[PDB]
Design an enzyme around this catalytic site. Sequence first.
Site, PDB file in Angstrom:
ATOM      1  N   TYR A  43       0.809  -1.209   0.000  1.00 14.99           N
ATOM      2  CA  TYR A  43       0.000   0.000   0.000  1.00 14.99           C
ATOM      3  C   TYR A  43       0.846   1.265   0.000  1.00 14.99           C
ATOM      4  O   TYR A  43       1.942   1.280   0.531  1.00 14.99           O
ATOM      5  CB  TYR A  43      -0.951  -0.019   1.201  1.00 14.99           C
ATOM      6  CG  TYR A  43      -0.355   0.398   2.522  1.00 14.99           C
ATOM      7  CD1 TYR A  43       0.272  -0.506   3.371  1.00 14.99           C
ATOM      8  CD2 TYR A  43      -0.457   1.710   2.945  1.00 14.99           C
ATOM      9  CE1 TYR A  43       0.797  -0.109   4.593  1.00 14.99           C
ATOM     10  CE2 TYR A  43       0.128   2.143   4.121  1.00 14.99           C
ATOM     11  CZ  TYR A  43       0.768   1.233   4.942  1.00 14.99           C
ATOM     12  OH  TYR A  43       1.308   1.751   6.095  1.00 14.99           O
ATOM     13  N   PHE A  53       2.362  11.320   4.048  1.00 13.98           N
ATOM     14  CA  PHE A  53       2.342  10.125   3.213  1.00 13.98           C
ATOM     15  C   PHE A  53       2.864   8.916   3.982  1.00 13.98           C
ATOM     16  O   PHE A  53       3.589   9.047   4.955  1.00 13.98           O
ATOM     17  CB  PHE A  53       3.247  10.328   1.992  1.00 13.98           C
ATOM     18  CG  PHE A  53       2.894  11.600   1.242  1.00 13.98           C
ATOM     19  CD1 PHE A  53       3.286  12.847   1.737  1.00 13.98           C
ATOM     20  CD2 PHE A  53       2.176  11.544   0.047  1.00 13.98           C
ATOM     21  CE1 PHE A  53       2.969  14.012   1.054  1.00 13.98           C
ATOM     22  CE2 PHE A  53       1.872  12.713  -0.653  1.00 13.98           C
ATOM     23  CZ  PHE A  53       2.247  13.946  -0.137  1.00 13.98           C
ATOM     24  N   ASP A  54       2.606   7.722   3.472  1.00  9.46           N
ATOM     25  CA  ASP A  54       3.103   6.527   4.124  1.00  9.46           C
ATOM     26  C   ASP A  54       3.120   5.419   3.083  1.00  9.46           C
ATOM     27  O   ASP A  54       2.175   5.343   2.334  1.00  9.46           O
ATOM     28  CB  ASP A  54       2.183   6.139   5.273  1.00  9.46           C
ATOM     29  CG  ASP A  54       2.479   4.784   5.878  1.00  9.46           C
ATOM     30  OD1 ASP A  54       3.672   4.494   6.065  1.00  9.46           O
ATOM     31  OD2 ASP A  54       1.514   4.038   6.185  1.00  9.46           O
ATOM     32  N   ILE A  73      -8.280   0.655  10.206  1.00 10.30           N
ATOM     33  CA  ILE A  73      -9.492   1.433  10.050  1.00 10.30           C
ATOM     34  C   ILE A  73     -10.543   0.613   9.281  1.00 10.30           C
ATOM     35  O   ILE A  73     -10.194  -0.318   8.537  1.00 10.30           O
ATOM     36  CB  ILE A  73      -9.176   2.771   9.380  1.00 10.30           C
ATOM     37  CG1 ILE A  73      -8.517   2.590   7.987  1.00 10.30           C
ATOM     38  CG2 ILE A  73      -8.402   3.687  10.315  1.00 10.30           C
ATOM     39  CD1 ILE A  73      -8.379   3.888   7.199  1.00 10.30           C
ATOM     40  N   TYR A  99     -10.636   8.041  10.865  1.00  8.24           N
ATOM     41  CA  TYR A  99     -10.302   8.479  12.239  1.00  8.24           C
ATOM     42  C   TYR A  99     -11.332   9.445  12.833  1.00  8.24           C
ATOM     43  O   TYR A  99     -11.121  10.002  13.902  1.00  8.24           O
ATOM     44  CB  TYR A  99      -8.855   8.972  12.296  1.00  8.24           C
ATOM     45  CG  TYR A  99      -7.837   7.896  11.969  1.00  8.24           C
ATOM     46  CD1 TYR A  99      -7.411   6.977  12.920  1.00  8.24           C
ATOM     47  CD2 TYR A  99      -7.328   7.746  10.684  1.00  8.24           C
ATOM     48  CE1 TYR A  99      -6.483   5.997  12.627  1.00  8.24           C
ATOM     49  CE2 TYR A  99      -6.365   6.784  10.380  1.00  8.24           C
ATOM     50  CZ  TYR A  99      -5.972   5.868  11.346  1.00  8.24           C
ATOM     51  OH  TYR A  99      -5.046   4.888  11.018  1.00  8.24           O
ATOM     52  N   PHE A 116      -5.723   5.677  -0.330  1.00  8.01           N
ATOM     53  CA  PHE A 116      -4.796   4.579  -0.407  1.00  8.01           C
ATOM     54  C   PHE A 116      -4.788   3.911  -1.770  1.00  8.01           C
ATOM     55  O   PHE A 116      -5.799   3.753  -2.419  1.00  8.01           O
ATOM     56  CB  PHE A 116      -5.103   3.450   0.569  1.00  8.01           C
ATOM     57  CG  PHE A 116      -4.992   3.828   2.042  1.00  8.01           C
ATOM     58  CD1 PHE A 116      -6.090   4.333   2.741  1.00  8.01           C
ATOM     59  CD2 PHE A 116      -3.838   3.563   2.735  1.00  8.01           C
ATOM     60  CE1 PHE A 116      -6.004   4.634   4.100  1.00  8.01           C
ATOM     61  CE2 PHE A 116      -3.738   3.910   4.059  1.00  8.01           C
ATOM     62  CZ  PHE A 116      -4.818   4.462   4.730  1.00  8.01           C
TER      63      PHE A 116
HETATM   64  C1  LIG Z   1      -2.560   6.501  12.984  1.00 11.34           C
HETATM   65  O1  LIG Z   1      -1.367   5.749  12.931  1.00 11.34           O
HETATM   66  C2  LIG Z   1      -0.846   5.406  11.722  1.00 11.34           C
HETATM   67  C3  LIG Z   1      -1.528   5.490  10.512  1.00 11.34           C
HETATM   68  C4  LIG Z   1      -0.918   5.071   9.339  1.00 11.34           C
HETATM   69  C5  LIG Z   1       0.367   4.556   9.371  1.00 11.34           C
HETATM   70  C6  LIG Z   1       1.036   4.438  10.576  1.00 11.34           C
HETATM   71  O2  LIG Z   1       2.287   3.929  10.696  1.00 11.34           O
HETATM   72  C7  LIG Z   1       2.961   3.477   9.521  1.00 11.34           C
HETATM   73  C8  LIG Z   1       0.438   4.863  11.762  1.00 11.34           C
HETATM   74  O3  LIG Z   1       1.061   4.758  12.985  1.00 11.34           O
HETATM   75  C9  LIG Z   1       1.428   3.454  13.497  1.00 11.34           C
HETATM   76  C10 LIG Z   1       0.215   2.684  13.980  1.00 11.34           C
HETATM   77  C11 LIG Z   1      -0.143   1.464  13.147  1.00 11.34           C
HETATM   78  O4  LIG Z   1      -0.113   0.140  13.669  1.00 11.34           O
HETATM   79  C12 LIG Z   1      -1.609   1.246  12.850  1.00 11.34           C
HETATM   80  O5  LIG Z   1      -2.341   1.164  14.061  1.00 11.34           O
HETATM   81  C13 LIG Z   1      -2.285   2.358  12.092  1.00 11.34           C
HETATM   82  C14 LIG Z   1      -3.598   1.942  11.594  1.00 11.34           C
HETATM   83  O6  LIG Z   1      -3.525   2.333  10.198  1.00 11.34           O
HETATM   84  C15 LIG Z   1      -4.544   1.970   9.439  1.00 11.34           C
HETATM   85  O7  LIG Z   1      -5.473   1.326   9.824  1.00 11.34           O
HETATM   86  C16 LIG Z   1      -4.352   2.510   8.021  1.00 11.34           C
HETATM   87  C17 LIG Z   1      -4.498   1.352   7.043  1.00 11.34           C
HETATM   88  C18 LIG Z   1      -3.250   0.429   7.069  1.00 11.34           C
HETATM   89  C19 LIG Z   1      -2.034   1.270   6.740  1.00 11.34           C
HETATM   90  C20 LIG Z   1      -1.835   2.333   7.763  1.00 11.34           C
HETATM   91  N1  LIG Z   1      -3.034   3.192   7.930  1.00 11.34           N
HETATM   92  C21 LIG Z   1      -2.956   4.530   8.158  1.00 11.34           C
HETATM   93  O8  LIG Z   1      -3.940   5.218   8.476  1.00 11.34           O
HETATM   94  C22 LIG Z   1      -1.630   5.229   8.018  1.00 11.34           C
HETATM   95  C23 LIG Z   1      -1.794   6.730   7.675  1.00 11.34           C
HETATM   96  C24 LIG Z   1      -2.317   6.924   6.241  1.00 11.34           C
HETATM   97  C25 LIG Z   1      -2.394   8.390   5.861  1.00 11.34           C
HETATM   98  C26 LIG Z   1      -0.992   8.963   5.869  1.00 11.34           C
HETATM   99  C27 LIG Z   1      -0.487   8.881   7.310  1.00 11.34           C
HETATM  100  C28 LIG Z   1      -0.472   7.466   7.867  1.00 11.34           C
END
Ligand SMILES: COc1cc2cc(OC)c1OCC[C@@H](O)[C@@H](O)CCOC(=O)[C@@H]1CCCCN1C(=O)[C@H]2C1CCCCC1
Length: 126
Positions: A43, A53-54, A73, A99, A116
């Site tokens: 992803y 970004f991530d 999420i 969120y 995403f």
């Molecule tokens: C809010 O915290 C993060 C969010 C995201 C990436 C992170 O780290 C790489 C984050 O902090 C570490 C915690 C992770 O274990 C997890 O709990 C997040 C849950 O994330 C999700 O459910 C979603 C889908 C799976 C990929 C990560 N995603 C995120 O929301 C990213 C966001 C995406 C928008 C850009 C900023 C990070």
Amino acid sequence: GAPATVTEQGEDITSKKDRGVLKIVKRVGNETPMIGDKVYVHYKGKLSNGKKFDSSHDRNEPFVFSLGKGQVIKAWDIGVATMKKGEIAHLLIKPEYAYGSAGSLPKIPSNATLFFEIELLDFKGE
Ligand SMILES: COc1cc2cc(OC)c1OCC[C@@H](O)[C@@H](O)CCOC(=O)[C@@H]1CCCCN1C(=O)[C@H]2C1CCCCC1
């Protein structure tokens, strides 16, 4: 922009049909995963405001979670469940499926929309 393409033509995959999760298949794959299955994805994601970004490609590896067990999420639990092996999809996600009003401060602002790109590599069972 990829988000724009989603917002205009993308498929509403929510049950309530409230447009909270929209999907465009970008590549057709080849069965979609069941709740509790182990999922493997590449992803990239970003905030609508363009400020964060991530990417899984940062770890140079797949991201793995158990489907439908609230470890990610709600949009992901819903979105990835609609995907077939090999599929690449874009998801555009309103705050209610990410969120919410509280956000995840300061990482994710209050009421943030997310985007995403997801490639479903595989999925194993419990
Ligand atoms: C809010 O915290 C993060 C969010 C995201 C990436 C992170 O780290 C790489 C984050 O902090 C570490 C915690 C992770 O274990 C997890 O709990 C997040 C849950 O994330 C999700 O459910 C979603 C889908 C799976 C990929 C990560 N995603 C995120 O929301 C990213 C966001 C995406 C928008 C850009 C900023 C990070």
